[PDB]
Amino acid sequence: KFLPFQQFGRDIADTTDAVRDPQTLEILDITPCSFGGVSVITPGTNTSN
Amino acid sequence: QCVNLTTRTQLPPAYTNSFTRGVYYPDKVFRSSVLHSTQDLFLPFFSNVTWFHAIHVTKRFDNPVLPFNDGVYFASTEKSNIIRGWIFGTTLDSKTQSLLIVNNATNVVIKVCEFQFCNDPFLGVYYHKNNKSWMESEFRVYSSANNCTFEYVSQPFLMDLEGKQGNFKNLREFVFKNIDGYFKIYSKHTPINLVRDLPQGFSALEPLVDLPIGINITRFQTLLALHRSYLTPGDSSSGWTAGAAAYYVGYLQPRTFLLKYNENGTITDAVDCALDPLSETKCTLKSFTVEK
Ligand SMILES: *[C@@H]1O[C@H](CO)[C@@H](O)[C@H](O)[C@H]1NC(C)=O
Numbered sequence: 467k468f469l470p471f472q473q474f475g476r477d478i479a480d481t482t483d484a485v486r487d488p489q490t491l492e493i494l495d496i497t498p499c500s501f502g503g504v505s506v507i508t509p510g511t512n513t514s515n
Numbered sequence: 516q517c518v519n520l521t522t523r524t525q526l527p528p529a530y531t532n533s534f535t536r537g538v539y540y541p542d543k544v545f546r547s548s549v550l551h552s553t554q555d556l557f558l559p560f561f562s563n564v565t566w567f568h569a570i571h572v573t574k575r576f577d578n579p580v581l582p583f584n585d586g587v588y589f590a591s592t593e594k595s596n597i598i599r600g601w602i603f604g605t606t607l608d609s610k611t612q613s614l615l616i617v618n619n620a621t622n623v624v625i626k627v628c629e630f631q632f633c634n635d636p637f638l639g640v641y642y643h644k645n646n647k648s649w650m651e652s653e654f655r656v657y658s659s660a661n662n663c664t665f666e667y668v669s670q671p672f673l674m675d676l677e678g679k680q681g682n683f684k685n686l687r688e689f690v691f692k693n694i695d696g697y698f699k700i701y702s703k704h705t706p707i708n709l710v711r712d713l714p715q716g717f718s719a720l721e722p723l724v725d726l727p728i729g730i731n732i733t734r735f736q737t738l739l740a741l742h743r744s745y746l747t748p749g750d751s752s753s754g755w756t757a758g759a760a761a762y763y764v765g766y767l768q769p770r771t772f773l774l775k776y777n778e779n780g781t782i783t784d785a786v787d788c789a790l791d792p793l794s795e796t797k798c799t800l801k802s803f804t805v806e807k
Pocket residue numbers: 510512513
């Protein structure tokens with residue numbers, strides 16, 4: 467519930483998780499995407515590629 | 516030009532502690548169900564403030580001014596609209612500008628001009644028997660005003676004026692701030708009807724209007740609508756006629772505090788960061804509950 471006297475929104479980490487348009491008042495939350503790191507599972511080079 | 520109408524009788528001031536009142540959102544940013552730490556001019560949970568009772572018909576006449584001193588936390592419980600507005604200025608003359616706010620059943624007027632201030636300013640309201648109504652016709656508070664700067668007129672923001680007989684069943688809480696040439700303004704309304712003076716509840720104030728005014732201010736005062744009394748020549752009464760009212764004032768201070776939200780997103784509880792050792796701990800670790 468957004469009280470109609472605030473302007474911005476920031477959960478934590480200075481994350482400005484409230485973006486609103488002057489004409490219409492809507493609240494929103496911002497989070498980084500899923501994303502993933504990688505690792506290669508290789509048997510012996512001399513065995514197979 | 517001006518008329519001096521002062522009473523030799525005087526009364527010493529009276530103090531009163533702030534139970535728990537005074538908290539708001541330090542910034543217009545929004546959060547929810549999380550605890551954050553900020554730093555802005557706030558009201559310490561357990562702080563002492565002063566009361567003001569100006570009711571002259573036993574009888575007592577005392578309407579002094581209050582220095583500004585870096586922000587003011589105002590409040591009152593008026594019912595008949597005894598307090599109309601206030602003024603500013605270090606010299607209380609035409610050499611400096613001032614802010615005038617008058618609210619009525621028609622509109623709300625916020626005039627910023629250099630109104631001349633008399634020795635004992637006070638509003639005057641008459642009573643027309645033929646009309647069976649009370650209005651205002653004496654406006655000798657200011658001799659004249661020039662160099663108009665700002666003027667805002669709009670409908671009554673939060674003035675109900677519906678109940679014909681309201682016996683102290685309302686509470687008004689605002690906050691006036693001045694920094695960097697901006698005289699910010701707030702507005703908060705929590706209805707209350709209790710035999711006591713202050714409640715044990717909790718709430719926060721919200722901004723009202725952002726009127727940027729650049730001028731040094733260190734002393735401000737309000738005005739009172741002294742009603743007219745019909746007295747015959749043989750009466751020779753005191754000549755002063757007014758209602759009953761008493762406004763509530765506080766003070767601002769810079770400090771770090773922790774405010775707590777809820778599922779809805781509205782502040783429900785908070786703990787001062789420097790009130791006592793126990794509270795310091797709640798700020799320090801993460802939250803309110805601490806194990807042995
Ligand atoms: C990998 O295979 C090669 C065959 O070309 C062999 O010469 C080498 O010894 C092998 N190395 C290991 C660690 O098995």
